[PDB]
Ligand binder design. Sequence first.
Ligand code: Y01
Lengths: 390, 36, 52
Amino acid sequence: TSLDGLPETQKYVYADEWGFSRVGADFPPGSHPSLFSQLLPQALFAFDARAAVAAVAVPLAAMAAGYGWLWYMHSIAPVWQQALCAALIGTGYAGLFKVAHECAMMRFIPQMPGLQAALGTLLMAPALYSLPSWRLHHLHHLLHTNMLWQDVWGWHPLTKVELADEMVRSGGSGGAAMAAARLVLTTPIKLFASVGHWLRSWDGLDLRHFHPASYVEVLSGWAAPLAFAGLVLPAVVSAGGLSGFVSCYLAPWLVFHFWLSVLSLTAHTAPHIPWRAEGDGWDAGRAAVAGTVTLRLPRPLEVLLNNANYMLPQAVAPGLPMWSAPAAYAVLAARLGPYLTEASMSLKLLTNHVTRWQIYDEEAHTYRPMEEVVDEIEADLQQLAAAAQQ
Amino acid sequence: XXXXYXXXXXXXXXXXXXXXXXXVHVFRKXXXXXXX
Amino acid sequence: APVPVYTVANPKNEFVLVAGENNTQLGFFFFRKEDAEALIEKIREENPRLAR
Ligand SMILES: CC(C)CCC[C@@H](C)[C@H]1CC[C@H]2[C@@H]3CC=C4C[C@@H](OC(=O)CCC(=O)O)CC[C@]4(C)[C@H]3CC[C@]12C
C-alpha cells in the first residue's frame, strides 16, 4: 500500500480529503486471498430458494414498472419523465446482469447446471454480451488483479511513460490519439468508458485466440447476442421508429453502462493503491485485500442491484453465493478491519475521479491531473531539447 | 333535430351551446368521454 | 350514399363524445375534414392521450 506506517491523524485527514471513510494500513507480503476463506462460517454457503427467486424477481418488477409507465405515456411526456423511466430500467437491468454474472461463475444454482447456463445466456444477451467470453475475461482479471501491463480487462490506468512515448511520436499534443485521450479521461464521459470494454469483447470475432476444443462453445456464445440484435432490435425500430428506439433501448443501455463503469472504476482505483509491475513487488493477496475499495450505497439501491457493490468477499471465497455477500463482509470487516478501504458514493468522489486522478506515474506511484502532468513533461521536453543543444 | 347557427366567429345553439370560434370552443350551458 | 361525412373516433371504433352538464353528451359529424382536424387539435391541448 502507498500510505505506510503513519499515525491515524494523517490517515483520517487524507480520508476526508479524498472522500473515503476508513483508509487502509499495510498487509504483509507473501499470501493469497483464498486463505481468508477459512474465516467464514460454513452456513454462509447454503442454498435457499427464497433469496434466489427474490433476486430474480425484484429487478424484473422494477423493469416491468418502468416499461408499463413508459408505454402508457409513450411520447407525450417531457424529457425528465423519459430520463427517470430510463434510469429505473437501467438499474433493474443492472440487477439482472449481476444475476447473470453469478451464473457465469457457476455459483447461482449449482444443482441444475443446464438451467443456470440457459438463464445466464438469456439475461446477458440484451446487453449484447457473451457468457463464455465473459467468464474467461473475468477469470483472467481475478488472476492478474492490479498487475501492471497485464490487467487489460480492468481499468488499466494511462501511465506517464506511454503518454510521453506517444507525445514523442506525435510531434506535439495535437494528434488524434491525443485529443481522444483528452476527452475520454477529462470529461464526465469517463463514467461510460465501459462501452469500450464492450467493444473489446468479440476478440476481433477471431476463433484463433481460443483453445480449439472449445470452438463450438464459443461460437454459440456469440450467437445469442447476434440473434438478439438480429431479431429484436429490428422489431423495436420497426414498431417505434428512431424515437421509439432511443427511448426504449438506447437510454436504458447507457444507464446500465454507467452503473457497470462506475462500479468497477471505483472498485479498483484510488491514490493510495499502487500498480506494481510483475516481478517488481506484485503480490496477490496484498492486491486483492489491500487494493480494493468497497462502495456503500443506500439499501434500496443495494437491493435493486443484488448487492453488486460487495466485491471483496467473493474474491477470497469464489464460491460464496450472492445473497450471503453483505453478511460475509461484516465478518471480514471484523478481522481484516485495519487494512480495508471503504467509501460512500457521493458527488465529491466522482468529481475527484474526473478532475484529479487522471494519469498514473510510477516514480511517485500516484495519480495526478492530466493537464499539469502533460505541461510538466512538456517543460521537460523543452529542457531535454536544451539538453539536445549538442 | 338540427342546430341553429348565427355567423356573427359563428355562434350556434343546440336542443350544449357550441361556439366554433374560427380553432373551436365547445362551451357549456371538457371532451372527456367515449361512446359505448 | 354518394355523399359522406367525417367523424373522429378511438382506434377501437368508438365515438368520442363531449359530455357537458348533467351528463349529457354530444356527438358530431363534419362535412369537412378540417373540422375534425380542429376538434382533435383542440383535444390535444387538454388531453394528449385521447388525441394520440
Ligand atoms: C447495429 C446495432 C443496431 C446492433 C449491434 C451490432 C453489434 C453486434 C456490432 C456492431 C459493432 C460491432 C463491433 C465493431 C468492432 C469490432 C472490431 C472488428 O475487428 C477488428 O477491427 C479487428 C482488428 C483490426 O481490424 O485491426 C470486428 C469485431 C467488432 C468487436 C464488432 C463486433 C460486432 C459489433 C459489436
